[PDB]
Amino acid sequence: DVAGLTPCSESKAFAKRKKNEVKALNKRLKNYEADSAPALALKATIARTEARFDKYAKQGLLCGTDGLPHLIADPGLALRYGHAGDVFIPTIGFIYFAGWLGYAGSKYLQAVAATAKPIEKEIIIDVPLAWKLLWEGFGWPLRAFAEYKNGSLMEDDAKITVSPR
Amino acid sequence: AFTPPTLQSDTPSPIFGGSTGGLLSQAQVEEFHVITWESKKEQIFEMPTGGAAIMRQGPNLLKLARKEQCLALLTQLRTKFKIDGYIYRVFPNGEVQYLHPKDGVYPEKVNAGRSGDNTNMRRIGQNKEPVQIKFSGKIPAEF
Amino acid sequence: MKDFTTYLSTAPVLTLLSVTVVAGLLIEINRFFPDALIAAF
Amino acid sequence: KKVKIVVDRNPVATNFEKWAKPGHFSRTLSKGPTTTTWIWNLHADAHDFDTQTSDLEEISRKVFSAHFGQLGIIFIWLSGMYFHGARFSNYEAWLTDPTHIKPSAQVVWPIVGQEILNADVGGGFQGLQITSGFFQLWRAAGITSELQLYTTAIGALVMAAAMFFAGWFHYHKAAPKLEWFQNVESMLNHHLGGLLGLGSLAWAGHQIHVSLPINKLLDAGVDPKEIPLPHEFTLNPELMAQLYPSFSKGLAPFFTLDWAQYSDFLTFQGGLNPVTGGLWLTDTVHHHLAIAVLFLIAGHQYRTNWGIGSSLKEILEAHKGPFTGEGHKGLYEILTTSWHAQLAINLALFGSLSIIVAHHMYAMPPYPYLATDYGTQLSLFTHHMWIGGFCIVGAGAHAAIFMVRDYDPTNNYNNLLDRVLRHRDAIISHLNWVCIFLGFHSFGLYIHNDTMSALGRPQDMFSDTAIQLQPVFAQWVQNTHFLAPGFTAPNALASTSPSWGGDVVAVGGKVAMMPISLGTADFLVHHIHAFTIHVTVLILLKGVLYARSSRLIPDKANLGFRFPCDGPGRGGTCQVSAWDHVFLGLFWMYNSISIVIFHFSWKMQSDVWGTVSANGVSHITGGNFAQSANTINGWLRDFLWAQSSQVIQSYGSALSAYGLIFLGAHFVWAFSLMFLFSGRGYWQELIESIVWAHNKLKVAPAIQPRALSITQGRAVGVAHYLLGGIATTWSFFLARILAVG
Amino acid sequence: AALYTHHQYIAGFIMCGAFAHGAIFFVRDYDPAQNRGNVLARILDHKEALISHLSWASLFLGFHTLGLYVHND
Amino acid sequence: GDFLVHHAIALGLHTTTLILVKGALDARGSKLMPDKKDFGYSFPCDGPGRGGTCDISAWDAFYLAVFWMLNTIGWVTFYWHWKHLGIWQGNVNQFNESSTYLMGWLRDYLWLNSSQLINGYNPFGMNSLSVWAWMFLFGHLIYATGFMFLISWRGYWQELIETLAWAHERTPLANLVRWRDKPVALSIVQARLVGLTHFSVGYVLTYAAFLIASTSGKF
């Protein structure tokens, strides 16, 4: 109970929603024979729905007035109440992966900028170099922090074009 | 010194069937332009008002609503036919003003003896700020 | 096959293959790990 | 002189070296992409062969091989449709019960909850309900087997491989010369007879030996499993004589010209088959045979390698009258030497053909059980309408392109092209006046009706119950068609379509086709259609006529067909090019076709489609067109709000994909408004600020990012606008017609 | 509802007018000589940073709000 | 749903501020047009040179930002009206589980509350809500008439006006009268302003009609 929300393990409307979904899928079932391919497909869909609802009740999600999971996007409020996987852990995951992709692209730009024809290397991508830099970009946070402390990550303003005010 | 050529009024016109893009009501009460050129053979050209016309051997006379039409015809004569021409500005009261080849040679070639007006001796960024010319009826670039 | 591999290294071929492999990886992730609302470890 | 095959042995080497370097085809794309404008221009000029080479021979060879590649793509598409009908379809189940089982030929993989899109179509099958009508076409052809669809898919894959091999062979091994492409006499003689005539004759042969017996057994009522295979119907005339007794005497009455004995399978009744609601297949056989004979006769008009025949140039140059000067002098040369003029003519007649197809296929269905499936009917009509309108706009575009590039005033003196160009102001002014008059007397009638309804004066609005505006000419034409059999059509046992008049054709409890009555609302919407068509014609014709020159800009031909403007001078010359006229005509065609398909859907949901109850017909919307389609609030409420409840409440069902696309297309349409309303300078300056941000972190691309060009922005905006609007209408139509019917 | 919507639309129009008149003051009444080193010249000096960060914030908000809405749809 | 619509409002404010601030700061000059301060606050363009200079003045940035202001205030007032419609009916749930996804916004708010509005007049009669139905269709008409000036630009219209001037200058029985002022197409800035004015008028009239009809007809 972090903001007037109840856990979906004990909230009644979550179970009501699960029952309604399973009942609708059973209403879909009650038209085919037991061993037909549509019957197997609907049975798989039912199993997936029950597994999803049981997993959501297991993971400790919060449900509001009705049975819909709510996520917490405050560190501390999610850390001490055990919901860091709602926003905080995916925040760290996205920051890592986006930094990996962006650092790989950046290093490709600075690697092909000092070649004979940097114009050609951006439509005709050197695949081994791109693969190597994509691998090297997995250590993007340490490399980026090192280049920031070295001062080689940013460019001086006196070497950057601006408009004449 | 150079003298402008006179507009010989009794000059033959190119063969043409009659267009809808020709002269209008502006010609009677403001102005209509005219272009004169010398052609070495009977051949077909394109009118600025639409359609095809045949200019005849010798002098050819064509009047047009605007000066831009006259220069379009002159430049297509100069490119696709290598033919020079003269453009005149004809007022409805009777006065005729010579126009494009004003000093004989074309404006893209120097003549030594022209007026070099509207030529500022500064850069683009050396104009005055608009606040320093505030409430004057002039743009910063004509100071 | 140098020219053929250069064509394969051209920007549209590489971006289509890259979005194809990324989309396929994400699709198989959702196939084996469906309905992952949160990063519950 | 002397039509013959001339080719060049091995003109272009086959290798991958130009695949490595994009932009090789044009000189202006050389020396690398200095900006992203190079990237956009590379796709912009990929098919502009005039800017690639100056030789008409190389352009013709490129066009020929591009046609072969397009044919290969179409064959791949057909193979895919037949393969999906074979493997992932309920076609055999649908054949047993076509009245109740909804056709489906595409299934989805259960990945992210998307298995809900697999509908309960019937026959123990789950899949997306298709609206393309392949099931009806296959039943008309007499398939009734899964293996035959797979065999056709394999054959179409083989034909696609053949098309691609032909294109490679005719660009790289034996490329035809320029004079081969200019044999228009031989090309017409072979397309009239050997393509269209022989194709119609071959389809008549198939229909005789395959479609007639199998569909006859299906109509009499037989499970398709025990129906004899098509070959054994073709193999001996015994079974054929059991089904059509005229086959007992064979080909003897044909060669002795006693053709009246073939009247059991070469018929002429008209109307529809009451079992299926489609046309009589014997009537289609007779039609195909007659038009095949007509086309094979038409294929001997033109002179080739022998003295018989008439030359196209001779027929053209002799059609000169006093009002037109030289007449058709120069038309043969500007059509045998310019591809864009032929493209304009062919695109115009092709789009008109597609529209005529849409009309003739709703009016009177040619396939069994096509009328009863309202979904495929509405989808087919709307699809062909949109294809026709697009092709017509492209015709205007390529006429403008020919006027800019391939128009030479030397060989076009005082001819019809010159005569039209010399009085373009009259034509454009008069079309402008017609457009204004039609806009007033169509839209202002609706506005007057709105005002009188909102003022509480229903007696003063234009309606059937007040001030009548009856389509008397159209109603009398319907009467003439209805009274045609037995009078002006003595050999017809029924009218061509039930739309003219007569009894309601009902198949499986649903109306196949019933008479359509025209009232005041139909009058108003037909005048709206005329107004929209006239304005689209005005824009396209104005672009074509003023592409060369103008009073405002006398040298527009120098600036080209596709240029943004000629500066802010002369008050402003934005969108003066013929390209921008095509750009505006695209929106106007969109408006026109949208109103046409809205009228179609409302009119047949209100007065045609419905169920029978042995005491009347219960229409889908209940006759609301006659009292609400004369008012804009009626269109907004009784059609555009009432029928929209099916697509917005489609979440959680099989139509949830249509519901999602209904919103995504709104998003795309409003996304177009960015490109349509804004201008390049703002985006360029914003990109400058972003480039500063990239320079600060050393992540500046060597290829300089530029804002989209003005023509680029207009093209992106119009593409997104038309895509969003058409997809919104498509999702709405399909969800509404698949949820109710 | 009418009062709220009226005042909100009036506020939006008036704020656009405020920014338009600020642009006019930069075009017309801005003197770089007497505004040399002060906060106006400072904010004009690094205007690329301001515009780029507004672009980043708008891009982030549009991406994330639209993505969440479409995922929910 | 309040979270999502608050981020929508934040996006609207941020983008409108972006356009307006960029127009102010680039008003004196940019890299595409360094001497923009000499040309004034409002001008059409700088011609098709340098790749194209459409909508380059600060006036054009204000012009683009008015659309974003209208969209932002539309989001704000849609949020307010739907929330209070849920409150006044006693059904806060309709907003609570329908504002989190956009189909709920389209169906449970725009489609649902417009039922009494579009029935202000019908073939069966009319009532007091007819004025708001007429204003609804009126605002739609003004909005699309704005789109007319927004999409089409000055050049097609100038040629058309020249053609009609040719028509009138030599139509019999109408050559007796002539224009004192030469008919010309609207200038680029002028027609941008006209399209923006029609856009704003149609926006405001349409939403005022819908809001007043859907609240007064229901309460």
Ligand code: CLA
């Ligand atoms: C890997 C290349 C790369 C990198 C490192 C950056 C980095 C940055 N961009 Mg940028 N951008 C890129 C590509 C890149 N961009 C491309 C291709 C486009 C055109 C679509 C843009 C368009 C763009 C805009 C309009 C803006 C930024 C902005 C920014 C800054 C804000 C952070 C951000 O992520 O914004 C968001 C970035 C994007 C939305 C574009 C991401 C597109 C993909 C994911 C990146 C390309 C991947 C590349 C091909 C990988 C190559 C791998 C290599 C081994 C070959 C930041 C420093 C903002 C800014 O100025 O902040 C102040 C801003 O307004 N970018």
Ligand code: CLA
């Ligand atoms: C009876 C002879 C005949 C036939 C049947 C065709 C048929 C066709 N021609 Mg062709 N043509 C012919 C004679 C013929 N032509 C002659 C004599 C000339 C010289 C004047 C040309 C010059 C010509 C040009 C320049 C073009 C065509 C094109 C086309 C295609 C039209 C587009 C389409 O999609 O149609 C419908 C599609 C089909 C009916 C699919 C069936 C395709 C099969 C393979 C047709 C086989 C007929 C072929 C002539 C047989 C000889 C080739 C053999 C060695 C395999 C079409 C298949 C256009 C095209 O698309 O290029 C490919 C086009 O560009 N023709």
Ligand code: CLA
């Ligand atoms: C038989 C049909 C046909 C043919 C052969 C041509 C051929 C040609 N056209 Mg044309 N045209 C046609 C029909 C046709 N057109 C139609 C129907 C229209 C109306 C829309 C037009 C309107 C048109 C214009 C306005 C122009 C041409 C131009 C051209 C020339 C260059 C094309 C090019 O390379 O640009 C590039 C082609 C592309 C970049 C392909 C992409 C185009 C769009 C983006 C595809 C649409 C998206 C598609 C529906 C997928 C949507 C789903 C998506 C979400 C993935 C070329 C000779 C251009 C020219 O300069 O003439 C000399 C010119 O500007 N055409």
Ligand code: CLA
């Ligand atoms: C709903 C918005 C809208 C409206 C009303 C119009 C209206 C018009 N367009 Mg247009 N257009 C639009 C959107 C719109 N367009 C958009 C978005 C685009 C971008 C693609 C275009 C692009 C476009 C082009 C390219 C062209 C037009 C043309 C025309 C005119 C055709 C003449 C006519 O219809 O006769 C009658 C007029 C009407 C039906 C308008 C409504 C008049 C009402 C019904 C009656 C008048 C009574 C009046 C209100 C009483 C006065 C009251 C007093 C107090 C003022 C017409 C005025 C064409 C043209 O110039 O003329 C041929 C032209 O070529 N439009």
Ligand code: CLA
């Ligand atoms: C205290 C408020 C205030 C004041 C004193 C000014 C004063 C001024 N403004 Mg400004 N402005 C304001 C607020 C204000 N503004 C607001 C709120 C906006 C946002 C909309 C603007 C946006 C704006 C722009 C973009 C420009 C000015 C300009 C100007 C200057 C010249 C005015 C002009 O162009 O002539 C008179 C103005 C008009 C006649 C307005 C035109 C009429 C409008 C657009 C149509 C209204 C139609 C109506 C709503 C229809 C009714 C609907 C019904 C029929 C259904 C002037 C010093 C111009 C300038 O500085 O020159 C460089 C300039 O271009 N203003």
Ligand code: CLA
């Ligand atoms: C529905 C209409 C619409 C939409 C979606 C946008 C969206 C946007 N506008 Mg815009 N605007 C509009 C209408 C619209 N506008 C109108 C009518 C005007 C008046 C002319 C303006 C005027 C305007 C100005 C003046 C500016 C913007 C800016 C922006 C960008 C702000 C950044 C952002 O929020 O990131 C959100 C991103 C999106 C909403 C794009 C959607 C995400 C895509 C679909 C993901 C890609 C997936 C897939 C690959 C799509 C391709 C499919 C294909 C390959 C088949 C953004 C892309 C500002 C800007 O450039 O920011 C820096 C800017 O200055 N707008």
Ligand SMILES: CC1=C(/C=C/C(C)=C\C=C\C(C)=C\C=C\C=C(C)\C=C\C=C(C)\C=C\C2=C(C)CCCC2(C)C)C(C)(C)CCC1
């Ligand atoms: C939370 C709260 C608080 C606090 C507060 C604060 C801290 C403050 C503030 C405030 C603010 C912060 C406000 C504001 C706003 C703003 C705005 C709205 C803006 C603006 C600007 C502009 C619009 C500009 C213009 C211009 C230009 C454009 C250029 C030139 C110059 C000029 C200026 C003209 C308290 C506790 C006390 C109480 C409760 C609540």
Ligand SMILES: CC1=C(C/C=C(\C)CCC[C@H](C)CCC[C@H](C)CCCC(C)C)C(=O)c2ccccc2C1=O
């Ligand atoms: C937004 C906008 C821009 C900016 C547009 C840009 C910079 C193009 C952005 C394209 C990016 C770089 C690629 C995005 C790729 C997408 C993921 C998918 C795009 C679809 C392709 C596959 C075709 C203009 O340049 C412009 C010019 C003239 C009038 C209006 C406008 C205009 O509205």
Ligand code: SF4
């Ligand atoms: S606004 Fe754009 S299209 Fe119009 S004249 Fe200026 S540069 Fe050309």
